[PDB]
Design a protein around this ligand. Structure first.
Ligand SMILES: *[C@@H]1O[C@H](CO[C@@H]2O[C@@H](C)[C@@H](O)[C@@H](O)[C@@H]2O)[C@@H](O[C@@H]2O[C@H](CO)[C@@H](O[C@@H]3O[C@H](CO[C@H]4O[C@H](CO)[C@@H](O)[C@H](O)[C@@H]4O)[C@@H](O)[C@H](O[C@H]4O[C@H](CO)[C@@H](O)[C@H](O)[C@@H]4O)[C@@H]3O)[C@H](O)[C@H]2NC(C)=O)[C@H](O)[C@H]1NC(C)=O
Ligand SMILES: *[C@@H]1O[C@H](CO[C@@H]2O[C@@H](C)[C@@H](O)[C@@H](O)[C@@H]2O)[C@@H](O[C@@H]2O[C@H](CO)[C@@H](O[C@@H]3O[C@H](CO[C@H]4O[C@H](CO)[C@@H](O)[C@H](O)[C@@H]4O)[C@@H](O)[C@H](O[C@H]4O[C@H](CO)[C@@H](O)[C@H](O)[C@@H]4O)[C@@H]3O)[C@H](O)[C@H]2NC(C)=O)[C@H](O)[C@H]1NC(C)=O
Ligand SMILES: *[C@@H]1O[C@H](CO[C@@H]2O[C@@H](C)[C@@H](O)[C@@H](O)[C@@H]2O)[C@@H](O[C@@H]2O[C@H](CO)[C@@H](O[C@@H]3O[C@H](CO[C@H]4O[C@H](CO)[C@@H](O)[C@H](O)[C@@H]4O)[C@@H](O)[C@H](O[C@H]4O[C@H](CO)[C@@H](O)[C@H](O)[C@@H]4O)[C@@H]3O)[C@H](O)[C@H]2NC(C)=O)[C@H](O)[C@H]1NC(C)=O
Ligand SMILES: *[C@@H]1O[C@H](CO)[C@@H](O[C@@H]2O[C@H](CO)[C@@H](O[C@@H]3O[C@H](CO[C@H]4O[C@H](CO)[C@@H](O)[C@H](O)[C@@H]4O)[C@@H](O)[C@H](O)[C@@H]3O)[C@H](O)[C@H]2NC(C)=O)[C@H](O)[C@H]1NC(C)=O
Ligand SMILES: *[C@@H]1O[C@H](CO)[C@@H](O[C@@H]2O[C@H](CO)[C@@H](O[C@@H]3O[C@H](CO[C@H]4O[C@H](CO)[C@@H](O)[C@H](O)[C@@H]4O)[C@@H](O)[C@H](O)[C@@H]3O)[C@H](O)[C@H]2NC(C)=O)[C@H](O)[C@H]1NC(C)=O
Ligand SMILES: *[C@@H]1O[C@H](CO[C@@H]2O[C@@H](C)[C@@H](O)[C@@H](O)[C@@H]2O)[C@@H](O[C@@H]2O[C@H](CO)[C@@H](O)[C@H](O)[C@H]2NC(C)=O)[C@H](O)[C@H]1NC(C)=O
Ligand SMILES: *[C@@H]1O[C@H](CO)[C@@H](O[C@@H]2O[C@H](CO)[C@@H](O)[C@H](O)[C@H]2NC(C)=O)[C@H](O)[C@H]1NC(C)=O
Ligand SMILES: *[C@@H]1O[C@H](CO)[C@@H](O[C@@H]2O[C@H](CO)[C@@H](O)[C@H](O)[C@H]2NC(C)=O)[C@H](O)[C@H]1NC(C)=O
Ligand SMILES: *[C@@H]1O[C@H](CO)[C@@H](O[C@@H]2O[C@H](CO)[C@@H](O)[C@H](O)[C@H]2NC(C)=O)[C@H](O)[C@H]1NC(C)=O
Ligand SMILES: *[C@@H]1O[C@H](CO)[C@@H](O[C@@H]2O[C@H](CO)[C@@H](O)[C@H](O)[C@H]2NC(C)=O)[C@H](O)[C@H]1NC(C)=O
Ligand SMILES: *[C@@H]1O[C@H](CO)[C@@H](O[C@@H]2O[C@H](CO)[C@@H](O)[C@H](O)[C@H]2NC(C)=O)[C@H](O)[C@H]1NC(C)=O
Ligand SMILES: *[C@@H]1O[C@H](CO)[C@@H](O[C@@H]2O[C@H](CO)[C@@H](O)[C@H](O)[C@H]2NC(C)=O)[C@H](O)[C@H]1NC(C)=O
Ligand SMILES: *[C@@H]1O[C@H](CO)[C@@H](O[C@@H]2O[C@H](CO)[C@@H](O)[C@H](O)[C@H]2NC(C)=O)[C@H](O)[C@H]1NC(C)=O
Ligand SMILES: *[C@@H]1O[C@H](CO)[C@@H](O[C@@H]2O[C@H](CO)[C@@H](O)[C@H](O)[C@H]2NC(C)=O)[C@H](O)[C@H]1NC(C)=O
Ligand SMILES: *[C@@H]1O[C@H](CO)[C@@H](O[C@@H]2O[C@H](CO)[C@@H](O)[C@H](O)[C@H]2NC(C)=O)[C@H](O)[C@H]1NC(C)=O
Ligand SMILES: *[C@@H]1O[C@H](CO)[C@@H](O)[C@H](O)[C@H]1NC(C)=O
Lengths: 214, 186, 219, 163, 163, 163, 186
């Protein structure tokens, strides 16, 4: 089966720079059936380029297409505020009948901002129910890459924590992340000190925020 | 506005032929004497009707110019298309050229003298290639006369030459079929 | 009218259930065009589901939905259908209809798309959220609400009955192993105002007719 | 030889076909879109100057977009393709008419009818000229009349087939 | 390339169109007028020798009347215009047929049907020849038959549209 | 110029017209006969590659049978006749498309629809290619669809006229 | 099999162009470097893309070859059609020939050096004449490049040369219109 591999997975650029998005195909393909699509979250995909190089109606000319054989390119000449979204390449005719790329995200490049870490102990209502969720918050940082390590009584925890990240803030282009360690009340009172350890390239050294039950 | 059958309004459109400047030549007329066929955004070809010669010899060393290969390949094609469209051309001494350094300099001596004039053939070809606004250049079974003594074809720069007629590609594209037609064996 | 595809259908079903998605054309010659279905499962990318030629002669299916999904059209009604049977949890996605025309005169492309159709396949029962406070512990402090164990999406969290909006981050929900969703909404406030100002999160979960307000207070 | 270049411009439209002259292709005018019924005549007619220009501008658009620009402008491509885009005997006709003092087409100006409520448009026909003077509308008014008739006939053929 | 010369001969007629071959254009015969429905086919057909001759004689008439005669006869004009008047592949067809012993058109003799009371006429078709011997009418009688049929079909299409 | 070679293959058939590609003209396939309604379109269309090939193979058949073979193969005849058989601008179109990365016709492979009980056949259309890769059927499926529609329209026009 | 509208089955046919071998030339491709245009059942023409020259002089004595009149008249027409279709040819020293004894030996020196290269013109003509399977010979506004140094055109024998692409007449028949087009005056 055909495989379309876009690169990079995430393209980080400031407003007003050339964005060069790439799409590489498993096999050699006919350019006439390569298409590009923009996808913002709040709406349906938007056809940008078809036939490798034809620009669809309503597309504002900074978007261009080129490519041949196995390597195809979508280019935005001057990134504008609305141009930061997901982009997908597409090939019709092989197997699957319509093949898609995994998508490239273009984001706003920013100065590096360090996360401001906060730890939240479990509420007593939650304990009265039988489960404990301790929440660690990483606020207003860039870039998005951040490592959260949950340690209980100085023991590394794996498999008991889900993460969730906000989308880039429209004003200051920062991210925020929350890690939720979920433990049963029984295991919660087994151990005393609870800590999340944050490593981000904006921090001078890995920051740890902790608490002791009570 | 003009309304036909009550509901159909007469409307017009004018094509901007300069959009084609990167794929095909564009002809236009500056004034009575100066006419242009441009290629792209950098180079072009000025067709002059003048009493002032620029070449006093009677040579057209194309074989030399080809070997040296310094000229603009598109401009040389146009020159060839122009000269190969001249009907019944037979006075090779009425055509002088200078290609030094790769320039294009071609001079037809229209004064070599109605229908059997070499000027007739040259002017007819000039009429067809500057078709847009060539009607102001000159005033008999298609046979034409002019008081001017020379047609000069020199390469020029890309400027706002099209001061009388807007650029058009029709004159050049319609001349392409006249090549090697009514040409004499030698 | 304007050239558009008007989506209909979708909703919530248990595994093994069925759902019929439909999509009606407006302002374009529906019969001229092939029709397509594309979905996006959460956190993943665009994925083609199935397609049907302009005259219904040919239908094609992604291997993942073969034998379960059946695409069809009614050119007289200018309508397109997707009958999803034997639904799986991984079939949860937004779904889109899109036209295309497959001729040697045009490239291949999907120019006209419908709006998203939400499909949720789960064994979970609809359940309002349990809202627990995230209490703050100089400078600025952070407090929030933990909206736990709700189904399905969405929930709308507002702070202080709409009046407090600056510096609020309501995080995307994570699907827990239980089959239920959980999220946190946080807000940073000046530490000085911890005593003077009261802080309420307002969690509305329209599918379960639940509106919960919770005081977050220090200690 | 006989022209063959097909016009491809169906994307995003209410029904495939037609052709839209962008602002770049028009002198001091906004975009002008012509429907399938008008443009589809260009596939068959052997004597509509505007159809030859449609293929010419489409070839220029296609060639620029699908081929990489050379360092020095070459006219090799247009010399190779001209006869698949335009009918060199059509402009021979216009040349012979000019030679003869008969009004002729210089390929620059065209006229069409436009329905005042449905927007339906006729295939533009060349506005003729002679010795630098363009014809007045009065010179070909009965042509405009029969064009309105063909528009009415086509509009009635459409309402019949739209059942 | 594809022919483009239009025939202009509507003056004083009952309805515009058609073409009248004057006595000068016919060998030992009086004037022959052909109606619009027959002649209008010359605007579309790519293989009717008589249509090529209609444009040829009309060009000769026009050129003589609208251009001043040179002192010495020049053939420059016809060399420039021939392909807008005739289909040089049509007479290539007639040449290849001749080479092959197949009956062919030498462009000199034509036949048509003529309604004995309404005078309606068909578009003349070339009377074929081979090695100096012209075909007998019997050789193409079924052609004449289908021509009479098309005449009857057209006469019935006219009575229908004449309401 | 415009093609003119007529196809002659009516002998022994149920009704005059059509054309049968013998086994010699087909790669690894038995004879294929196409009816009058399909083949008669070749007399009018200016852009069907298969029609140009029909005239090419018919000219080859005719020339071989009606002319005596030379000692050394001469290509004089085909150089003289090529433009009465094929539209050199049609393959210019295919060349320009190839140059542009657009799928094009290499004149070798064609597709048609064939009614499963009445045997009625459509005029074969060229199967396009690009950089050595032939299009998949999916690439032009909607073309096949409208072809089936024209077949149904023609079959209904026949039942109407068969009264 | 594919059924459209329930009753129309999709079917295909492939023309055997070798049936035309006695009336018109047939082009085909043997491999990346070797391409053929055949005439009839006895003779033909091998087009080679190679780094190995076969002619070290710079002569193309056509006038001599014509007078002696020993060559195959059809093959010489093809050679002429090929060379007369080269756009903007101007380096006559890049073309060497040997016609001794009536053979056909023509060598274009592609290494005489993008769009103004004589190789461009030669390769474009080669592209059009070996149209069937020329895409595997080489990989910019139609302008082409190649790492090969020579295009050689030699007469050959009738053998099973068409080992990569099946014989076709289209490449030759469609080149016929490019003759004396974009040709320079000399
Ligand atoms: C048209 O659709 C084709 C698939 O459609 C199916 O088949 C047709 C005939 C109908 O029956 C239809 O109803 C079916 O749905 C599609 O076929 C694809 O063709 C490409 C070649 O263009 C193949 O890629 C090459 O595959 C070979 C074989 O190994 C593959 O085997 C299996 C399939 O059996 C694949 O799943 C594997 O992943 C393997 O890739 C490889 O050898 C080759 O890779 C190497 O070789 C080439 C040179 O040979 C090098 O250039 C590469 O860099 C590698 O070094 C290719 O990957 C593809 O497998 C094949 N898929 C199928 C399912 O057959 C065809 O592409 C469509 N045409 C167009 C123009 O889109
Ligand atoms: C176009 O080409 C013309 C010919 O070009 C030559 O041949 C071609 C095939 C190429 O190889 C090309 O590269 C060659 O140059 C060319 O005309 C030539 O112009 C030169 C001047 O630069 C002439 O040289 C002069 O020769 C005379 C004597 O020769 C004449 O008389 C004899 C006897 O009657 C004849 O047999 C000849 O054919 C000539 O008619 C010398 O007296 C003269 O000496 C002085 O002249 C120059 C003048 O400035 C001085 O600067 C020198 O220092 C000398 O002191 C030259 O030596 C050459 O004869 C002439 N050939 C012909 C056939 O007329 C023409 O100039 C080219 N035009 C352009 C625009 O390039
Ligand atoms: C293509 O034609 C070329 C020219 O052909 C001649 O002219 C045409 C119009 C016809 O009439 C044709 O039939 C003629 O042959 C041809 O080039 C020619 O090749 C021959 C060799 O066979 C040369 O003869 C040799 O001449 C030199 C001296 O002449 C040279 O120098 C003088 C002074 O500089 C110049 O004025 C000349 O133009 C030359 O540049 C002799 O030294 C030499 O003697 C020995 O050479 C051979 C070598 O093997 C020995 O076998 C002999 O026995 C001698 O002992 C030759 O006599 C001739 O000069 C040359 N002409 C030119 C203009 O270069 C070419 O070979 C033809 N190509 C093909 C593939 O047919
Ligand atoms: C010679 O031929 C060339 C090829 O046809 C011509 O090139 C074209 O030139 C125009 C500018 O003159 C380029 O326009 C582009 O447009 C952006 C912004 O335009 C904005 O406005 C339009 C409405 O007018 C709107 O629709 C757009 O969406 C934009 O928002 C300019 O900033 C750029 O310059 C950009 O290139 C064409 O793109 C360009 N085409 C190509 C293929 O290069 C050239 O103009 C011709 N020369 C002459 C003298 O006519
Ligand atoms: C080059 O062009 C030539 C002219 O088109 C080709 O000549 C043709 O070659 C074939 C053989 O390849 C000849 O076939 C004839 O058939 C008989 C017997 O065939 C029997 O089988 C068929 C069914 O397949 C059946 O229908 C017949 O009735 C027969 O019963 C052979 O024994 C003979 O060889 C005979 O000639 C063609 O007749 C022949 N045509 C001409 C005009 O000469 C030649 O094949 C081409 N070369 C290549 C390589 O394709
Ligand atoms: C190449 O073919 C020629 C010609 O073959 C004849 O013409 C063809 C179109 C086809 O109809 C063949 O069947 C014909 O035989 C050959 O020259 C003839 O060869 C035959 C025997 O094969 C012989 O009887 C004739 O006298 C020859 N001369 C003619 C017909 O003028 C020639 O031998 C073939 N060359 C090779 C290398 O096979
Ligand atoms: C153009 O041609 C004319 C006519 O052949 C040349 O005019 C002649 O020039 C010389 C002297 O100037 C004499 O032969 C005659 O006295 C002139 N005759 C006429 C009728 O003028 C003229 O010189 C040529 N111009 C160029 C630049 O070569
Ligand atoms: C170029 O020179 C010619 C030389 O003949 C000029 O034509 C002559 O002009 C005078 C006075 O204007 C007339 O008396 C002659 O009858 C003209 N000769 C003709 C028409 O053959 C011509 O005017 C000059 N052109 C320019 C622009 O100076
Ligand atoms: C006509 O063309 C010539 C040749 O290109 C021009 O002269 C050259 O111009 C380039 C830059 O454009 C210089 O680098 C060369 O040194 C020039 N060479 C010579 C011999 O002049 C010439 O300028 C052009 N003429 C016009 C009017 O545009
Ligand atoms: C025909 O006339 C109508 C009205 O005069 C034109 O419609 C205008 O153009 C826009 C989009 O192109 C339409 O949405 C509006 O109805 C009109 N806008 C105005 C008048 O500002 C239409 O473009 C004309 N068609 C042609 C080919 O000229
Ligand atoms: C068709 O036949 C009729 C009668 O045979 C011809 O009509 C004759 O011509 C004049 C004027 O041309 C008519 O007014 C008369 O009715 C007839 N006069 C006679 C018979 O002396 C008519 O010309 C024929 N048409 C053609 C094209 O030959
Ligand atoms: C269309 O399909 C039919 C059936 O598939 C084909 O008919 C076959 O051919 C012979 C004679 O050619 C017929 O008498 C039989 O009905 C069929 N014989 C078989 C299937 O062995 C017909 O040839 C097809 N037409 C084309 C152009 O391919
Ligand atoms: C083909 O042309 C090239 C370039 O003109 C020739 O290569 C030159 O050959 C000689 C020595 O071999 C010298 O002029 C240079 O050193 C070479 N230059 C390059 C770039 O290779 C080559 O000889 C020609 N081939 C033939 C057979 O004439
Ligand atoms: C023919 O010779 C050319 C000489 O340039 C070869 O091309 C060079 O190959 C080497 C090594 O393969 C590369 O490093 C150079 O960059 C190439 N030069 C180019 C591409 O201009 C070519 O490979 C030879 N071909 C064959 C078939 O031997
Ligand atoms: C290229 O053509 C030449 C000339 O016909 C061939 O050489 C002749 O071949 C014939 C027989 O085919 C012999 O009778 C002559 O004696 C040969 N003459 C010479 C000078 O060789 C040559 O064999 C052909 N080359 C190829 C590869 O087919
Ligand atoms: C064409 O095919 C060749 C050979 O398989 C390949 O190298 C090339 O990438 C393909 N695409 C082109 C030339 O655009």
């Amino acid at each position: 089966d055909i495989v379309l591999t876009q690169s990079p997975g995430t393209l980080s650029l400031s407003p007003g720079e050339r964005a060069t998005l790439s799409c590489r195909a498993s096999q050699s393909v006919i350019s006439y059936y390569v298409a590009w699509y923009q996808h913002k979250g709040g709406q349906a995909p938007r056809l940008l380029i078809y036939g490798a190089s034809s620009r669809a109606t309503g597309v504002p000319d900074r978007f261009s297409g080129s490519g041949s054989g196995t390597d195809f390119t979508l280019t935005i000449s001057s990134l504008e505020p609305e141009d930061f979204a997901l982009y997908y390449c597409q090939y019709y005719g092989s197997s699957p009948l319509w093949a898609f790329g995994q998508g490239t995200k273009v984001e706003i490049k920013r100065t590096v901002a360090a996360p401001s870490v906060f730890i939240f102990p479990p509420s007593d209502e939650q304990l009265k129910s039988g489960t404990a969720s301790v929440v660690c918050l990483l606020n207003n940082f860039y870039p998005r890459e951040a490592k959260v390590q949950w340690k209980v009584d100085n023991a590394l925890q794996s498999g008991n924590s889900q993460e969730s990240v906000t989308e880039q803030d429209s004003k200051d282009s920062t991210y925020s992340l929350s890690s939720t360690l979920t433990l049963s009340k029984a295991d919660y009172e087994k151990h005393k000190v609870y800590a999340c350890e944050v490593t981000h390239q904006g921090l001078s050294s890995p920051v740890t925020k902790s608490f002791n039950r009570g | 506005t003009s309304l036909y059958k009550g509901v159909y309004e007469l409307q017009t459109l004018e094509l901007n032929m300069e959009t084609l400047n990167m794929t095909m030549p564009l002809s236009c007329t500056k004034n009575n004497s100066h006419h242009y066929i441009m290629v792209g955004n950098e180079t072009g070809l000025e067709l002059t009707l003048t009493n002032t010669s620029i070449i006093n010899h009677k040579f057209c060393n194309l074989s030399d110019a080809h070997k040296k290969n310094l000229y603009d390949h598109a401009l040389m094609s146009i020159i060839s298309t122009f000269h190969l469209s001249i009907p019944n051309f037979n006075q090779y001494e009425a055509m002088s050229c200078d290609f030094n350094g790769g320039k294009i300099s071609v001079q037809y001596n229209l004064s070599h003298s109605h229908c059997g004039t070499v000027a007739n053939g040259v002017l007819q070809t000039f009429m067809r290639m500057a078709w847009g606004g060539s009607y102001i250049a000159l005033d008999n079974w298609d046979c034409i006369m002019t008081s001017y003594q020379y047609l000069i074809i020199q390469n020029t720069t890309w400027e706002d030459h099209c001061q009388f007629s807007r650029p058009s590609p029709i004159g050049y594209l319609c001349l392409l079929s006249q090549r090697t037609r009514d040409i004499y064996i030698s | 009218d304007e050239v558009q595809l008007v989506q209909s259908g979708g909703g919530l079903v248990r595994p093994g259930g069925s759902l019929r998605l439909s999509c009606a054309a407006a302002g374009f010659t529906f019969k001229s065009y092939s029709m397509n279905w594309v979905r996006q499962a959460p956190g993943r990318g665009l994925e083609w589901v199935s397609s049907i030629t302009s005259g219904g002669s040919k239908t094609y299916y992604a291997d993942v939905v073969k034998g379960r999904f059946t695409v069809s059209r009614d050119n007289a009604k200018q309508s397109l259908y997707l009958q999803m049977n034997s639904l799986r949890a991984e079939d949860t996605a937004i779904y889109f209809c899109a036209r295309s025309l497959h001729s040697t005169s045009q490239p291949s492309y999907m120019d006209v798309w419908g709006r998203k159709i939400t499909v949720i396949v789960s064994s979970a029962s609809t359940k309002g959220p349990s809202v627990f406070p995230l209490a703050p512990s100089g400078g600025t402090a952070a407090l929030g609400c933990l909206v736990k164990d709700y189904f399905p999406e969405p929930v709308t969290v507002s702070w202080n009955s709409g009046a407090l909006t600056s510096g609020v981050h309501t995080f995307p929900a994570v699907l827990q192993s239980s089959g239920l969703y959980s999220l946190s909404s946080v807000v940073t406030v000046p530490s000085s105002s911890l005593g003077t100002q009261t802080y309420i999160c307002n969690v509305n979960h329209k599918p379960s007719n639940t509106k919960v307000d919770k005081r977050v207070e220090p200690k | 030889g006989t022209f063959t270049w097909t016009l491809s411009d169906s994307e995003g439209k209410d029904t495939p076909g037609g052709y839209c002259l962008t602002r770049w292709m028009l002198i001091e005018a906004e975009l002008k879109c012509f429907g399938n019924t008008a443009v589809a005549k260009c596939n068959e007619k052997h004597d509509e100057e505007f159809c030859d220009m449609l293929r010419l501008f489409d070839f220029n658009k296609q060639a620029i977009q699908r081929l990489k620009a050379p360092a020095q402008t070459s006219i090799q491509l247009i010399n190779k393709a001209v006869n698949a885009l335009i009918n060199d005997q059509l402009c021979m006709k216009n040349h012979l008419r000019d030679i003869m003092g008969i009004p002729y087409c210089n390929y620059s100006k065209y006229w069409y009818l436009n329905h005042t409520t449905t927007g339906r448009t006729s295939l533009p026909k060349c506005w003729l000229v002679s010795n630098g003077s363009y014809l007045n509308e009065t010179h070909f008014s009965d042509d405009i009349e029969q064009q309105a008739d063909n528009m009415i006939t086509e509009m009635l053929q459409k309402e019949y087939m739209e059942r």
